[PDB]
Amino acid sequence: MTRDQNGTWEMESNENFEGYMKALDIDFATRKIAVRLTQTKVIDQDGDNFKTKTTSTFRNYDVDFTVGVEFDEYTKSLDNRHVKALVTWEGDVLVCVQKGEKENRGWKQWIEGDKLYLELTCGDQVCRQVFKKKL
Numbered sequence: 710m711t712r713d714q715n716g717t718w719e720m721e722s723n724e725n726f727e728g729y730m731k732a733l734d735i736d737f738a739t740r741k742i743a744v745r746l747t748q749t750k751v752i753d754q755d756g757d758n759f760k761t762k763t764t765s766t767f768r769n770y771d772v773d774f775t776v777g778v779e780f781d782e783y784t785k786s787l788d789n790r791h792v793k794a795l796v797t798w799e800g801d802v803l804v805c806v807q808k809g810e811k812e813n814r815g816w817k818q819w820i821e822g823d824k825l826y827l828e829l830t831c832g833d834q835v836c837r838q839v840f841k842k843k844l
């Protein structure tokens with residue numbers, strides 16, 4: 710019973726964000742700034758309805774979805790691609806498949822203890838992020 714991801718979450722680790730960005734074809738100059746940043750994630754969740762904001766000093770990215778309902782996602786100001794996205798529950802893990810021109814693109818997000826874990830995948834690259842809840 711850990712599906713409730715509501716809150717504001719502050720990044721404490723970001724493993725292989727470089728490789729994930731390179732797999733998305735983010736240019737070197739953009740990666741050079743992006744890899745340095747602490748990200749914050751704000752999740753406003755009402756059951757299966759999610760409104761999410763991921764923020765930093767350099768880029769912000771909002772994505773809203775209902776679990777089980779495919780949607781068009783445009784990764785504006787990130788890699789600027791259009792995908793068909795579907796978020797599902799696997800147990801209490803939120804699983805997103807982003808179908809489009811990059812193979813094996815998606816993410817998984819879940820709560821463990823007082824941490825929010827986010828694993829971002831593109832191709833053969835996995836980025837593992839951990840966030841600590843803000844009080």
Ligand SMILES: CCCCC/C=C\C/C=C\CCCCCCCC(=O)OC(CO)CO
Pocket residue numbers: 730733735739743744746748750761763764765767768769770772786787788816818827
């Ligand atoms: C927004 C801050 C970025 C800081 C770096 C800036 C520029 C580097 C460009 C591209 C990298 C791709 C990043 C992908 C991040 C997706 C975040 C996402 O979709 O999370 C899901 C799960 O939480 C949303 O519900």
